[PDB]
Amino acid sequence: AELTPEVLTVPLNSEGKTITLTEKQYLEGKRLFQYACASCHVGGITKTNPSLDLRTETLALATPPRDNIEGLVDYMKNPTTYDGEQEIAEVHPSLRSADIFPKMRNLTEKDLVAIAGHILVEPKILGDKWGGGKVYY
Amino acid sequence: ELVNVVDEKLGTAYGEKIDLNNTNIAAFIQYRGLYPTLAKLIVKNAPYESVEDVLNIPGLTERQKQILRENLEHFTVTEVETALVEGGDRYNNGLYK
Amino acid sequence: METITYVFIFACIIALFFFAIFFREPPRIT
Amino acid sequence: GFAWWAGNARLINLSGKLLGAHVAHAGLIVFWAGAMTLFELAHFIPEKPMYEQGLILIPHIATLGWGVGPGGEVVDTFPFFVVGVVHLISSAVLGFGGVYHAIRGPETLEEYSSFFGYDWKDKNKMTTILGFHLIVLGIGALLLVAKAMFFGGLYDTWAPGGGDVRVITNPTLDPRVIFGYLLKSPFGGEGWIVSVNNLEDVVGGHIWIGLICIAGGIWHILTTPFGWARRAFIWSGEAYLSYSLGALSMMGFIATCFVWFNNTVYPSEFYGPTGPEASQAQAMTFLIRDQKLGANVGSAQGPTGLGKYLMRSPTGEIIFGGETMRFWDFRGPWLEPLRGPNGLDLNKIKNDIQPWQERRAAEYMTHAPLGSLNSVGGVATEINSVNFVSPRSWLATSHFVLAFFFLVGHLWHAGRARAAAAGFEKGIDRESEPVLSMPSLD
Amino acid sequence: ANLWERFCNWVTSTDNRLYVGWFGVIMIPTLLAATICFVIAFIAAPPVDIDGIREPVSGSLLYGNNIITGAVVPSSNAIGLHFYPIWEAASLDEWLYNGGPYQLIIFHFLLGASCYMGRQWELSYRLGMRPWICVAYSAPLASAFAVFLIYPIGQGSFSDGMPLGISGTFNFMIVFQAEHNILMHPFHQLGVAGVFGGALFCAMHGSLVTSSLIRETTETESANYGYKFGQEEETYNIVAAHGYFGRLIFQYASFNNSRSLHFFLAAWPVVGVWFTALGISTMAFNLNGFNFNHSVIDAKGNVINTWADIINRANLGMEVMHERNAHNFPLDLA
Amino acid sequence: AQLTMIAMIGIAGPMIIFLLAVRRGNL
Amino acid sequence: MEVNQLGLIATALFVLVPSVFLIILYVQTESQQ
Amino acid sequence: QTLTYDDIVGTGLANKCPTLDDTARGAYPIDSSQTYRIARLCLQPTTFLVKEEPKNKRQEAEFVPTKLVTRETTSLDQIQGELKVNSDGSLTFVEEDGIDFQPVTVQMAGGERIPLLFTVKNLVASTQPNVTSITTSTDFKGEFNVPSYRTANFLDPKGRGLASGYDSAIALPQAKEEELARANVKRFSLTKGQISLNVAKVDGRTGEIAGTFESEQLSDDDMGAHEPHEVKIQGVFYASIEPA
Amino acid sequence: KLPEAYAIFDPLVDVLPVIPVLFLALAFVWQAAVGFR
Numbered sequence A: 001a002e003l004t005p006e007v008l009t010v011p012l013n014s015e016g017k018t019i020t021l022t023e024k025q026y027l028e029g030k031r032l033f034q035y036a037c038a039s040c041h042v043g044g045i046t047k048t049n050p051s052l053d054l055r056t057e058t059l060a061l062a063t064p065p066r067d068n069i070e071g072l073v074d075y076m077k078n079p080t081t082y083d084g085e086q087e088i089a090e091v092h093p094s095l096r097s098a099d100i101f102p103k104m105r106n107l108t109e110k111d112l113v114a115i116a117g118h119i120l121v122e123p124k125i126l127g128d129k130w131g132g133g134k135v136y137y
Numbered sequence B: 001e002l003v004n005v006v007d008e009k010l011g012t013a014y015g016e017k018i019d020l021n022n023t024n025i026a027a028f029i030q031y032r033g034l035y036p037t038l039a040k041l042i043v044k045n046a047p048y049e050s051v052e053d054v055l056n057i058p059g060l061t062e063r064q065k066q067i068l069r070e071n072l073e074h075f076t077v078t079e080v081e082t083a084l085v086e087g088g089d090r091y092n093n094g095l096y097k
Numbered sequence C: 001m002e003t004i005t006y007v008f009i010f011a012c013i014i015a016l017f018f019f020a021i022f023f024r025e026p027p028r029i030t
Numbered sequence D: 001g002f003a004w005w006a007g008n009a010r011l012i013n014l015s016g017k018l019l020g021a022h023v024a025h026a027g028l029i030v031f032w033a034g035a036m037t038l039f040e041l042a043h044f045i046p047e048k049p050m051y052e053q054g055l056i057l058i059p060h061i062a063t064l065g066w067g068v069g070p071g072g073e074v075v076d077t078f079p080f081f082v083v084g085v086v087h088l089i090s091s092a093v094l095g096f097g098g099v100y101h102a103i104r105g106p107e108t109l110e111e112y113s114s115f116f117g118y119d120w121k122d123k124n125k126m127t128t129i130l131g132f133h134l135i136v137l138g139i140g141a142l143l144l145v146a147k148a149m150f151f152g153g154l155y156d157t158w159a160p161g162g163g164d165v166r167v168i169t170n171p172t173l174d175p176r177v178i179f180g181y182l183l184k185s186p187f188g189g190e191g192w193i194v195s196v197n198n199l200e201d202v203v204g205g206h207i208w209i210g211l212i213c214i215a216g217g218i219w220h221i222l223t224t225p226f227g228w229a230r231r232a233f234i235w236s237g238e239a240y241l242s243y244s245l246g247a248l249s250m251m252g253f254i255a256t257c258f259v260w261f262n263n264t265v266y267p268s269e270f271y272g273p274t275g276p277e278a279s280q281a282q283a284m285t286f287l288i289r290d291q292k293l294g295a296n297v298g299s300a301q302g303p304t305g306l307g308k309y310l311m312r313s314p315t316g317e318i319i320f321g322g323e324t325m326r327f328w329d330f331r332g333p334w335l336e337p338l339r340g341p342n343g344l345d346l347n348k349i350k351n352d353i354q355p356w357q358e359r360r361a362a363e364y365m366t367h368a369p370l371g372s373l374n375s376v377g378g379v380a381t382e383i384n385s386v387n388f389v390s391p392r393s394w395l396a397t398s399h400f401v402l403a404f405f406f407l408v409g410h411l412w413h414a415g416r417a418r419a420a421a422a423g424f425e426k427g428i429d430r431e432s433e434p435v436l437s438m439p440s441l442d
Numbered sequence E: 001a002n003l004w005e006r007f008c009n010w011v012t013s014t015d016n017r018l019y020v021g022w023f024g025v026i027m028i029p030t031l032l033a034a035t036i037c038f039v040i041a042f043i044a045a046p047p048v049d050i051d052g053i054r055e056p057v058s059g060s061l062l063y064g065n066n067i068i069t070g071a072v073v074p075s076s077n078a079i080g081l082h083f084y085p086i087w088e089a090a091s092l093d094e095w096l097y098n099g100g101p102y103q104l105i106i107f108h109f110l111l112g113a114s115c116y117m118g119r120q121w122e123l124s125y126r127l128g129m130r131p132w133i134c135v136a137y138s139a140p141l142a143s144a145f146a147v148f149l150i151y152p153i154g155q156g157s158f159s160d161g162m163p164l165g166i167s168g169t170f171n172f173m174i175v176f177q178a179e180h181n182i183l184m185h186p187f188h189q190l191g192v193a194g195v196f197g198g199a200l201f202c203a204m205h206g207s208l209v210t211s212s213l214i215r216e217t218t219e220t221e222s223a224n225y226g227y228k229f230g231q232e233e234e235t236y237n238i239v240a241a242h243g244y245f246g247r248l249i250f251q252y253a254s255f256n257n258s259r260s261l262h263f264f265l266a267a268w269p270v271v272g273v274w275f276t277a278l279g280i281s282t283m284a285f286n287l288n289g290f291n292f293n294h295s296v297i298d299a300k301g302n303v304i305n306t307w308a309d310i311i312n313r314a315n316l317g318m319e320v321m322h323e324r325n326a327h328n329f330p331l332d333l334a
Numbered sequence F: 001a002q003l004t005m006i007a008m009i010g011i012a013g014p015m016i017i018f019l020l021a022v023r024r025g026n027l
Numbered sequence G: 001m002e003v004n005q006l007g008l009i010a011t012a013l014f015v016l017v018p019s020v021f022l023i024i025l026y027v028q029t030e031s032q033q
Numbered sequence H: 001q002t003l004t005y006d007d008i009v010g011t012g013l014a015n016k017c018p019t020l021d022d023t024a025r026g027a028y029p030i031d032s033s034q035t036y037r038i039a040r041l042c043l044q045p046t047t048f049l050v051k052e053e054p055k056n057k058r059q060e061a062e063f064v065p066t067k068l069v070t071r072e073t074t075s076l077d078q079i080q081g082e083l084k085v086n087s088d089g090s091l092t093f094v095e096e097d098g099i100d101f102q103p104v105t106v107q108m109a110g111g112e113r114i115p116l117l118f119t120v121k122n123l124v125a126s127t128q129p130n131v132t133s134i135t136t137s138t139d140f141k142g143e144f145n146v147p148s149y150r151t152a153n154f155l156d157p158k159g160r161g162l163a164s165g166y167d168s169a170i171a172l173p174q175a176k177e178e179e180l181a182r183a184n185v186k187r188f189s190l191t192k193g194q195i196s197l198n199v200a201k202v203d204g205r206t207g208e209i210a211g212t213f214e215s216e217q218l219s220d221d222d223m224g225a226h227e228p229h230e231v232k233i234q235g236v237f238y239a240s241i242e243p244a
Numbered sequence I: 001k002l003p004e005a006y007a008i009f010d011p012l013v014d015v016l017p018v019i020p021v022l023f024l025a026l027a028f029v030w031q032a033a034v035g036f037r
């Protein structure tokens, strides 16, 4: 098995446009996800709120839907609760709150796409392990 | 006369849908727009006599009222089971991942 | 009955320690 | 008559070559301090907490008030560079004197000069060297005081508004406070001197110690040991070494507990949270999450009958529940705003938790000092992803190992010094075996 | 003739059947206190709330234990590292519920064993011996400090110290593996090498000396009677032992110097056990065994399990079950 | 790379011994 | 507790029979001189 | 003047309710036109009595004294709720929230441990009619709920539970289960207790009251494994009254 | 990172901390040279 363009093809938006990442983007995305996110989101879970994971089906049911590049890039700029009703930049890393989350300061727009693509690709590779937690280790 | 009431409850609509009187709050993530805001209101205002009673929760915006109507078919109500609602277990039932 | 047995054996071992130390065969040179 | 593997024992009575060994070794220590600082700076990224980066020396400099501002943010890396350069440069001077005295200088100093020469058995000369070094040590303790009071202050994790560099204007002088620490129990809730929790006590303790060391240095220059001390000790270089090994061992075990429990002179901003701190922060985190969802955290009974979020300590204080019940002695600047007279205050919990406290708890819970030897962060069952071992675990484990081995060395050299002093360190004289002239035991 | 100096002479007398000594002045009362409390608690102590969750664990014989299952149970997690002497309890009943005896026993024992080590130095000096037997005993002594004191200090509670019992010991080992992956820690691997190697070299040395006993007896008597206590001549032929062992392997893998040989015997297990004691003492601060969980993945990113991932599955089953009522939050951070 | 310097530095030490055991010095 | 009642006689003979064997042999050793 | 945490910590005082000056013999008047809350209700038990079992049924068992073994972990505090004025001038406190339970275990003669959930959960307690002033002779009487001492996730030592755990005795695979049913099937009791609060001190200036309470409730039944004991608790209380 | 003007030295600095280890190893090369005397 290998990292083909099929697996590297993810939804860009809610309208069905797709984008194919490079292997470079995917590995960059992985590295950046480890840099800025894995301390809470290792393996697609959320250590400080396990009810909410990074599984694609969970993200699909978020308001704004987050199961696509645009929704995820926006989330990294301006995070909301799962129902979209409240903005949570003061307690969740984002570019809006890079003053209080310094690791977000040196993230470029291209870095955001790479992180978002990693989150969308990894369940395609790992299946239930992504977001499933220790049961699947 | 010696029966496990939680097992018994799994044989009701509780085992099939979100029971507005018993189910832990994390289940409201299974449908869109319900968690955390409406979920918090639903649980605080239980118990309910009919699923339709949720629409009479004071303070619902009309957006919130519409989200509930969309999802009423995913809800049920059964009798309150003490074992499931004591201990604050509707907010945290000890299950994480 | 099982408690009595366990403590009895233990007590015999402690008594054996006493004899083994104070009533040992004395080591004697050459 | 020593073998090559005990070859440094051949220096015991070569004061000149032994001086070179000591001074050259001192160069190695200062060299590592400089080289390691520069290595840490070369790798330092300011946007990442220090404790995600494997740093142990930059935290020590930051703690003295150099390079940092409010909240522990790094504002200027130049002081770090300076510290490293000056140490590194200084190590060449020590290395130079060291190899000169070890290889080219007078092998013994007693002939070149009666002031620098010494005989281990000269109790007057030995206490005079001790006295000089005590004065040096006392001056060193007063330098810390000078820094804190006259040259910029120290980093104060307890400062209002997130921590900051603060000049210490009223150091604690009350000996009931200063020596009160020395008399507190080392057990939980007390913590002996490890519980020092404010910089006023830190600086005042160093005023006391500086004065005590200078006074004792003067005392030992001017006196010779009294008869009761003459008859209690072994007077030989190996004996003196053994005494110092015991002292270093003691100090290393203390240092171990300091870095594991104390978050005042090892600010968690730099070193990461303590084990207790991280455990408390987990309970805080889920209290916050659950309360936001509507849970009444004060009245929530957990599976055991004890509160799920809150319970009482054995003396009644309201404390976090779950296993962290063991850590309720923890005190930290992000948590104390919630504490009332009876412990955690339910009304503050319901009403006054601030976003910065939520952030700090989440940060500390996810940076608990647990990790694998290959630096995979978290509990032992965690998958690879996070590269992290807390600096507190690195500093605690290393210094436990060193302290243990120095206690072994104390025992080794103390036992040998006694046997050599009485003349049987090379074995039993076949013709005068003590046991053969004792009555049999039975 | 002075009372104090006669007392001093009896304390340090080499003529007492058991040597007392100044270390003995502390060792004897503290070991007797630990021993007497231990025996009584093991037989009759009521159940102890080890994990502080009002779930008492029965450790004594009269409360339904046998020798294998019985234990003196560690003190309550509610106490943590707090000092809990008897006079701090409102009653003995309270002290027993909360696990007081454990604290009394382990503190008296660790003090007494420390003095046991010093006592070994002390008599060696009175007898004109070399001094380092006590250094050999520092390896087991360090190991007892690790499981009774250092590990509780690091984890914040005497409730995570090793129980004083056979099955309690196994419980401590299993939990340790789930939380620290001790098997994958090099200091424990060195402990195994120290202990397996120590047993190996014990048998080797015993069998080589036994193989080369000089004929001094008949087939009808124990060969042990060929040696007489205090005889001056060696009782075996070390050159024959070396002649056999050097051919079993090759010449230069066999000792012909008995001093180097016996130093090696001393050093191998002592040093191995130092390391394993340091292993427990540093896992006390959560610097855990190697983690190779999901270290091998394929070209696509699938995890390819190794034996380390299988270990992990076992560790998880230990983790999720231990102290099954004691955790309310998702990470077991101590 | 970094392996260039650690080579120059790593050889400094044996270099000293070599020069001295060839110039029969006070080793 | 519901232990095997034969465990008592098993334990008693396991201790008694080997111990007596050794005592027999020791005492007849002593009386040889 | 009042104390700080570091004055209190470790003394036992954290488990004690505020006391009122023995001079506080006033009255706190009530205006049916205003609303009130209990801003803080504190209950500090001093005595745990457990009823014995007299073998027969013609002598009746007594309440006997017990020893606390769980230390200074017993007080209920920070309880709040509505203080309502009824048509007939009686007052009714309705508990809303607080640290309103503590597990306690006391030990009887002979060594039996008796765990109980000391609680006032869902307390509703009412005065006589025509109060109009809280005085040093005002009595509140009420009822509260006593949930099961362990909640539903609790696993017994063989892994059996209500909401989690095994449903059988797995170590006895072919044993007759009918005999094990009481231990195997867990159940969650919910019983009522009764409490009297007797006001003996009133600071009219500040709204604080204090006095004595007696409570009666059941002990732990270990999820239906055995029958509970009847427990009587006595202690002192303190409450602070506020206009809404 | 080091100040820009010393940037030239990053790869040397990455090696400096290890040098004290080399003094220990050098002690054994020296002893090998004189025959473990």
Ligand SMILES: CCCCCCCCCCCCCCCCCC(=O)OC[C@H](CO[C@@H]1O[C@H](CO[C@H]2O[C@H](CO)[C@H](O)[C@H](O)[C@H]2O)[C@H](O)[C@H](O)[C@H]1O)OC(=O)CCCCCCCCCCCCCCCCC
Pocket: E036, E046, E091, E092, E093, E096, H110, H111, H112
């Ligand atoms: C071999 C080497 C050479 C030779 C060496 C020499 C060897 C000598 C061997 C010595 C052997 C010692 C044996 C130790 C026994 C310890 C007994 C104990 O702890 O027993 C002592 C008794 C035990 O107390 C009872 O202990 C009980 C403990 O019960 C527990 O135990 C019971 C079992 O009986 C049940 O299981 C029960 O359910 C369970 O909870 C209760 O708590 C009672 O309330 C409590 O009174 O003490 C009391 O009650 C007495 C006074 C109570 C009066 C009440 C007022 C209090 C006054 C303060 C007392 C001052 C004490 C001074 C101490 C002086 C020390 C020198």
Ligand code: CLA
Pocket: D003, D004, D005, D006, D007, D008, D009, D010, D011, D017, D018, D020, D021, D022, D024, D025, D092, D094, D095, D096, D099, D102, D103, F016, F017, F020, F026, F027, I024, I027, I028, I030, I031, I037
């Ligand atoms: C910090 C470690 C340390 C230090 C400082 C010393 C120091 C010393 N040792 Mg000990 N030794 C050590 C470790 C150490 N040893 C270890 C690990 C072992 C085990 C192998 C030994 C085994 C040992 C033996 C067997 C003996 C010593 C002896 C000596 C002394 C004389 C050595 C001599 O003339 O060599 C001559 C060596 C040379 C001429 C070779 C070059 C050595 C130089 C100093 C290298 C310096 C390099 C450096 C880059 C220079 C920077 C210069 C710059 C600052 C200007 C000297 C004081 C001897 C002694 O006691 O004499 C009576 C002796 O017999 N040592």
Ligand code: CLA
Pocket: D019, D023, D090, D093, D094, D096, D097, D098, D100, D101, D105, D106, D109, D112, D113, D116
């Ligand atoms: C504690 C360490 C120490 C000790 C006890 C000695 C002792 C001695 N040395 Mg050695 N030496 C040392 C370190 C040491 N030296 C160092 C570090 C170097 C390298 C610079 C040398 C280089 C050296 C040489 C080249 C020679 C000696 C000689 C001597 C002898 C006479 C010294 C004299 O008359 O000076 C008298 C006093 C002074 C000159 C006053 C100096 C005041 C000092 C420098 C100020 C204090 C410095 C301070 C602590 C550092 C501040 C920190 C800074 C980094 C910011 C004496 C036996 C001589 C000898 O043995 O001849 C055969 C000789 O020729 N030494």
Ligand code: CLA
Pocket: D127, D130, D134, D182, D183, D212, D213, D214, D215, D216, D217, D219, D220, D223, D224, D225, D226, D229
């Ligand atoms: C490195 C530090 C150092 C060293 C090695 C020495 C060494 C010595 N001193 Mg000096 N001394 C020092 C610092 C030092 N001193 C300082 C700073 C002062 C000023 C206060 C003094 C004041 C001083 C006086 C006044 C005297 C000495 C004497 C002596 C000699 C006997 C010491 C002795 O028997 O101790 C062994 C200690 C004891 C027998 C008593 C133990 C007391 C402690 C506090 C018990 C605590 C033990 C506990 C387990 C540890 C925890 C600490 C606790 C307080 C919390 C010896 C040469 C004596 C001498 O001959 O003078 C010429 C003497 O009379 N010293």
Ligand code: CLA
Pocket: D004, D005, D006, D007, D008, D009, D241, D245, D405, D406, D407, D408, D409, D410, D412, D413, D416
């Ligand atoms: C201030 C500290 C100090 C000082 C000055 C001394 C000084 C001395 N010791 Mg003592 N020693 C110490 C601490 C100290 N020791 C400690 C802490 C211990 C316990 C571990 C001992 C145990 C000890 C023993 C057992 C003996 C001495 C002996 C000696 C004498 C000769 C030593 C020699 O030539 O070594 C030469 C150096 C070597 C042979 C090198 C040893 C290399 C070590 C063991 C490995 C280090 C590797 C390190 C952990 C990192 C590796 C990581 C990775 C690469 C794998 C000398 C007087 C001897 C003696 O009694 O003489 C009187 C002796 O037999 N020492």
Ligand code: HEC
Pocket: A033, A036, A037, A038, A039, A040, A041, A046, A048, A049, A052, A053, A054, A055, A058, A059, A062, A066, A072, A075, A076, A080, A081, A082, A088, A092, A093, A115, D362, D363, D366
């Ligand atoms: C802890 C300090 C976190 C870090 C670091 C990061 N995330 Fe996070 N995330 C965290 C929490 C507590 C939550 C829940 C927020 C809520 O209350 O709803 C989240 C949520 C997300 C989500 C949404 C998941 C979903 O809707 O199913 C996403 C997509 C997410 N977080 C992404 C994300 C990224 C990309 C991060 C690195 C830049 C990152 N998080 C860090 C906690 C934390």
Ligand SMILES: CC1=C(/C=C/C(C)=C/C=C/C(C)=C/C=C/C=C(C)/C=C/C=C(C)/C=C/C2=C(C)CCCC2(C)C)C(C)(C)CCC1
Pocket: D021, D024, D025, D027, D028, D031, D085, D088, D089, D091, D092, D094, D095, D096, D098, D099, D102, I006, I009, I023, I024, I026, I027, I030
């Ligand atoms: C005796 C002896 C010994 C020992 C020795 C020793 C120990 C030595 C030491 C020595 C030393 C201790 C040395 C040091 C040196 C140093 C130096 C020489 C330095 C330099 C510096 C520099 C040049 C710098 C530079 C820089 C800067 C300035 C800035 C930044 C960058 C850089 C870093 C580049 C032995 C064992 C071997 C053997 C036997 C004998």
Ligand SMILES: CC1=C(/C=C/C(C)=C/C=C/C(C)=C/C=C/C=C(C)/C=C/C=C(C)/C=C/C2=C(C)CCCC2(C)C)C(C)(C)CCC1
Pocket: D177, D178, D179, D181, D182, D193, D196, D201, D202, D203, D204, D205, D206, D208, D209, D232
């Ligand atoms: C700084 C500081 C401080 C202070 C401190 C101090 C002040 C200290 C002191 C300390 C001290 C003050 C110490 C002491 C010590 C001592 C010891 C350690 C001793 C020991 C001893 C010994 C060892 C002995 C022995 C012996 C005997 C017993 C007998 C005879 C013989 C001999 C001699 C051997 C504080 C905390 C506030 C804070 C922070 C900082």
Ligand SMILES: CC1=C(/C=C/C(C)=C/C=C/C(C)=C/C=C/C=C(C)/C=C/C=C(C)/C=C/C2=C(C)CCCC2(C)C)C(C)(C)CCC1
Pocket: E020, E024, E025, E026, E028, E029, E032, E033, E034, E036, E037, E040, E041, E044, E045, E046, E092, E101
């Ligand atoms: C004088 C002297 C001496 C001697 C000493 C001695 C001999 C001592 C002893 C001591 C002792 C002999 C001790 C004892 C101790 C004990 C203890 C301290 C105990 C405790 C116990 C307990 C407390 C118990 C409890 C319990 C339990 C656990 C269970 C059941 C119940 C009861 C309650 C009973 C000598 C020779 C050294 C020399 C010097 C002088």
Ligand code: OEX
Pocket: D323, E051, E077, E155, E159, E160, E175, E179, E322, E323, E326, E332, E333, E334
């Ligand atoms: O107590 Mn005994 O064991 Ca050491 O982690 Mn946490 O805590 Mn408990 O859990 Mn896993």
Ligand SMILES: [Cl-]
Pocket: E171, E175, E321, E322, E323, E324
């Ligand atoms: Cl367990």
Ligand SMILES: [Cl-]
Pocket: D321, D322, D323, D324, E326, E327, E328, E329
């Ligand atoms: Cl927990």
